[PDB]
């Protein structure tokens, strides 16, 4: 039973006192201690604070912990920009007899300028059309923050079909990247006058419009 609910995000300007709670049950945190882990996503985590409150020496004095009954919290008291990692809490549930991990919190440091998407859109390749297929590819680059919305249209009308969009990643352009692959029939594709990948990032929507009869 993986009830160690943490609030999925935590904001904060540099230097401020940012806390992350985590409410569990009597049967886990109510019973055993909580630890705090720091994970750079996908990659090898690390012991940030143990036995409720204590630091591993080597952890900066700026981090502190605290139980309170059936719940417990981590506070970062001096919010540096490096503090942008994932924060997991965890506690041995004596009922289940299991190590129960948190649901995770991603701490975001609020200083960086909104970089706009650099949307670049390619039509189906003529060879790909000979293999009886139509793939429109929309590419979205150099944007920040990492929340984009890609929407597919054709002529004047929304398209929801074969629209497989990636989730925004991390280029060490220090900014975010995404893709979205619209999948048609060669036959569908030429039925319309114009396809567009409009992509909306912090109020601003940016289109890129493509048309079947380039040359003609």
């Amino acid at each position: 039973q993986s009830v160690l609910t943490q609030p999925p995000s935590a904001s904060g300007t540099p230097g401020q006192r940012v806390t992350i709670s985590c409410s569990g049950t009597s049967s886990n945190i109510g019973s055993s201690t909580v630890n705090w882990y720091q994970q750079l996503p996908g990659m090898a985590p690390k012991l940030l604070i143990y036995r409720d409150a204590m630091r591993p020496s080597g952890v900066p004095d700026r981090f502190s912990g605290s139980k309170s009954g059936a719940s417990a919290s981590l506070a970062i008291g001096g919010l540096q920009s490096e503090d942008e990692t994932d924060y997991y809490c965890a506690a041995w549930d004596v009922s289940l007899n299991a190590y129960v991990f948190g649901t995770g919190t991603k701490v975001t440091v609020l200083g960086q300028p909104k970089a706009n998407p650099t949307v670049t859109l390619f039509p189906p390749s003529s060879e790909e059309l000979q293999a009886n297929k139509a793939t429109l590819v929309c590419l979205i680059s150099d944007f920040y923050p990492g929340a984009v919305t890609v929407a597919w249209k054709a002529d004047g009308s929304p398209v929801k079909a074969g629209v497989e969009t990636t989730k925004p990643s991390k280029q060490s352009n220090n900014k975010y990247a995404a893709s979205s692959y619209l999948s048609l029939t060669p036959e569908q594709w030429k039925s319309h006058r114009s396809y567009s990948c409009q992509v909306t990032h912090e109020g601003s929507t940016v289109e890129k419009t493509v048309a079947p009869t380039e040359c003609s």
Binding site: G42, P45, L47, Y50, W92, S125, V137, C215
Partner: protein
């Protein structure tokens, strides 16, 4: 220095098996309890098992229960995970960590993981080694901003990750921008590369994308050439 390394399977067919190893270093193994912890991609950390210092007992997560097995050889200095009956949900990176305590976890005390170690990836999928159909994504004549042009390669419908898409036998760099793959409904992937070049240049030069999908052993070269439409790019230099 505590050094923990796993060494275990990657891609398997659902219903097959793997066996993750994890050797330790820097500490007296036979004194500490060990964990196995996984993490399906872009989700949290999930605990999978604990085994006591002396292996007298060992606990599992409900999920993993009865399919998986935590084994430990105090001798060679290794922690195992025997994964039978692999389900597609089992996907992810498997970590082995150390319990920094007195070699179990109980109602008295539970230190939990102090050092972890790296991770080894496993992908369970109902999905077989398929080679990339590389269709060239050709540059247009339609004049964008004044930020010149950008042309590329669609490396479509493959398995498994990864693929290696270099430009012009790797002569061509940092114009280049190869995106992360989308994992499509198929259970098959797709990436793209885009080399963003001066509109000028387009038609003096010979951009050829060199794709390599090791697991199919698929080496595909593809010329990425402008549409006959472009006369200003396709016509001979006047």
């Amino acid at each position: 220095e505590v050094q923990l390394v796993q060494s275990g399977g990657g891609v398997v067919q659902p219903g097959r098996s793997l066996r993750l190893s994890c050797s330790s270093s820097g500490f007296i193994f036979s004194s500490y309890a060990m964990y196995w912890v996984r993490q399906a991609p872009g989700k949290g950390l999930e605990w999978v098992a604990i085994i006591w210092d002396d292996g007298s007992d060992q606990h599992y997560a409900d999920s993993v229960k009865g399919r998986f097995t935590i084994s430990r050889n105090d001798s060679k200095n290794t922690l195992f995970l025997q994964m039978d009956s692999l389900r597609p949900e089992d996907t992810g990176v498997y970590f082995c960590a150390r319990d920094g305590g007195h070699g179990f976890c109980s109602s008295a005390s539970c230190f939990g993981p102090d050092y972890w170690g790296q991770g080894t990836p496993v992908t369970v999928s109902s999905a077989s080694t398929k080679g990339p159909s590389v269709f060239p994504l050709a540059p247009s004549s339609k004049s964008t901003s004044g930020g010149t042009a950008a042309l590329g390669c669609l490396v479509k419908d493959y398995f498994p990750q990864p693929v290696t898409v270099s430009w012009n036998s790797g002569a061509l760099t940092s114009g280049v921008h190869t995106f992360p793959a989308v994992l499509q409904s198929s259970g098959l992937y797709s990436l793209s590369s885009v080399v963003t070049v001066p509109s000028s240049s387009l038609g003096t030069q010979t951009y050829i994308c060199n794709v390599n999908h090791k697991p199919s052993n698929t080496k595909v070269d593809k010329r990425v050439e402008p549409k006959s439409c472009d006369k200003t790019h396709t016509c001979p230099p006047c």
